[PDB]
Amino acid sequence: MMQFTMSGTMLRFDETTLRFSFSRDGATWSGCDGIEPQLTRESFSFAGAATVTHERIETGTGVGVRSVFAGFADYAFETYIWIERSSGDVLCEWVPLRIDRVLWPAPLSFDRADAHDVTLITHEQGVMIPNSWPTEVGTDAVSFGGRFETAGGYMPWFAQLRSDGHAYIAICETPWNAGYDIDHPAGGPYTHVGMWFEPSLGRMDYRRVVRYRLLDHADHTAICKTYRAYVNERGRLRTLAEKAARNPSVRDLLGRSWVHVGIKTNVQPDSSFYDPAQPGKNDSLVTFAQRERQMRTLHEMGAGRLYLHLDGWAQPGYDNGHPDYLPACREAGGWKGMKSLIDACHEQGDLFGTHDQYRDYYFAARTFDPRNAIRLADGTMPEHAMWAGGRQTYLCAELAPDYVRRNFSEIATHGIVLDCAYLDVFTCNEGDECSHPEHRMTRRECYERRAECFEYLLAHGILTSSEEVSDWAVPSLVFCHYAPYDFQMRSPDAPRHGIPVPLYNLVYHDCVIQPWMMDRVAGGDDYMLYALLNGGAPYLIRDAAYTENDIERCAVVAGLHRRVGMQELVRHDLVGGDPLVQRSVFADGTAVTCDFHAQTYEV
Numbered sequence: 001m002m003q004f005t006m007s008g009t010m011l012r013f014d015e016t017t018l019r020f021s022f023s024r025d026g027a028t029w030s031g032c033d034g035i036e037p038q039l040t041r042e043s044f045s046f047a048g049a050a051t052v053t054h055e056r057i058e059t060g061t062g063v064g065v066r067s068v069f070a071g072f073a074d075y076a077f078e079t080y081i082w083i084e085r086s087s088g089d090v091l092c093e094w095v096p097l098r099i100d101r102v103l104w105p106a107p108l109s110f111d112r113a114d115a116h117d118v119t120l121i122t123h124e125q126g127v128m129i130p131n132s133w134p135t136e137v138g139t140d141a142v143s144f145g146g147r148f149e150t151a152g153g154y155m156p157w158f159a160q161l162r163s164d165g166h167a168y169i170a171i172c173e174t175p176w177n178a179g180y181d182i183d184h185p186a187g188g189p190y191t192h193v194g195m196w197f198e199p200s201l202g203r204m205d206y207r208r209v210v211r212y213r214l215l216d217h218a219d220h221t222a223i224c225k226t227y228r229a230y231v232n233e234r235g236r237l238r239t240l241a242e243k244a245a246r247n248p249s250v251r252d253l254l255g256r257s258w259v260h261v262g263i264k265t266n267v268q269p270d271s272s273f274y275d276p277a278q279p280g281k282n283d284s285l286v287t288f289a290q291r292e293r294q295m296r297t298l299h300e301m302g303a304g305r306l307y308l309h310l311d312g313w314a315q316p317g318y319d320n321g322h323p324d325y326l327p328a329c330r331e332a333g334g335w336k337g338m339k340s341l342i343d344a345c346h347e348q349g350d351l352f353g354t355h356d357q358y359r360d361y362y363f364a365a366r367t368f369d370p371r372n373a374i375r376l377a378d379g380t381m382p383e384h385a386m387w388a389g390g391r392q393t394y395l396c397a398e399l400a401p402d403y404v405r406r407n408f409s410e411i412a413t414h415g416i417v418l419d420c421a422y423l424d425v426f427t428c429n430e431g432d433e434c435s436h437p438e439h440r441m442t443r444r445e446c447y448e449r450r451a452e453c454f455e456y457l458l459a460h461g462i463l464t465s466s467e468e469v470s471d472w473a474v475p476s477l478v479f480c481h482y483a484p485y486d487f488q489m490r491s492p493d494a495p496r497h498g499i500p501v502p503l504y505n506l507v508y509h510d511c512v513i514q515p516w517m518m519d520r521v522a523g524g525d526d527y528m529l530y531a532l533l534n535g536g537a538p539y540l541i542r543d544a545a546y547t548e549n550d551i552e553r554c555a556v557v558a559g560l561h562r563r564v565g566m567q568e569l570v571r572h573d574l575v576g577g578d579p580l581v582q583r584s585v586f587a588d589g590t591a592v593t594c595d596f597h598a599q600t601y602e603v
């Protein structure tokens, strides 16, 4: 049993049982009784080590315990758990030495009850999940198994807050092969939240580091402010302002209303979406001519300022032939009708973006070669046929920019000036690992190659879009398809995982523009309230791949956007401790209040 006191915090670490605990400002947190730090293969505790060494350490930078673990059959690794002098933070390092996952640090005890002490997780826009919450919240119920750099982990942190206002945030400083793990039992007494780490390309390769910061007199607002600061203290908090200094078009997205509609549909036979009764469900076409007149009419009706995202615009048809997604669909009016539509949009003060796809790599593609595809760490090629274009694998992001550069050249060759562009999935799904000797790529590398893809667009004054908003992309992404809450991605019938809190826009409102769902759910929540509280852009039309007081509703949300769209969301609060009735405050003092009993808002 070692003990360390440094810079206002105290660390405790048990020599023999491995359970560690920290304290600062008189609040103690502790590893749960009965959860071992583990390794996995086809589960061994750390204590399972044939040899275990512990060395007390004082460096000029902090103090703590280094531990070596050999054994298990031959394998070895190391942990370093220390207090940083400058700040008071505790840092946990797992250190390869030479295995499927690593679950370490072991989760902190946050049992139990007391409806007001909450877990904050980062699964899409925030989820504030109180310890007494009725519904079960597990990792199986979280997108992509709770994996950072995805929809299941918008930001590489989680946090636990007590009624006391005594919190800890946990920041993953090595996210690219990592995620968090959540166990909140239905109505549970406790919520346990823990970090997990996977090998990169078959091997734990690089050290993995978690940074804990204990907070006192703490808000959920404040917990997000800590991360924001961490991010900027590392130069990855890219504002719209910074983006705007390079491409002022960023400013033209404020106040805009979103129209998402498409041109061609063409479900293939091998596709999961194919049924033989009937075709015509499998084939549909709306022409450029029709979308022209659509956009015409929306202006005439007073829709206002608009951005048109255009699905299915190329010849093979929506979700077909990627990356050979050329030419612009003939049967809808070829390059010409497309050219004419784009012209028309600009001609009435409206913006336009293409829908494109560079991860999904179809066999039906004109240029398909298995030589350009992903190979997993076991050297296999992944295959599915979930989507419209049928059989596919994934294109190694190592080759992604080649294809972005080639395609958008062709597009521009035909007098088409894209305002924006949407490269699909990049910002929602995980980075691939690629083991192909001819283009080896780690998950870290994959996000950089995706960002290189975005940056080519930015270089051509073409704004940037993708599915969702995983923070890796923050420096190269202008806007998204949405940054919704988890509950908006489930049937409104589904029991929810917690209180919706805008944890993300708390961190990035002033960095990435998001359109929002405008739906009303019968017998419940109007999704306009969430757009408001999140100071976002409104959807007017949202035609899915698989007007009626709308304009009047949009123009409310749009107007607030123009005022606030680039500003920091400084505060979000729950009016009088009640989960419904929430307030969010922006940089310029604007307070959007939203009553969830009354379905009302106040601007």
Ligand SMILES: [Ca+2]
Pocket (backbone or CB within 6 Å): 260, 309, 310, 311, 355
């Ligand atoms: Ca789309």
Ligand SMILES: [Zn+2]
Pocket (backbone or CB within 6 Å): 373, 374, 375, 396, 397, 398, 434, 435, 436, 438, 439, 440, 441
């Ligand atoms: Zn590759």
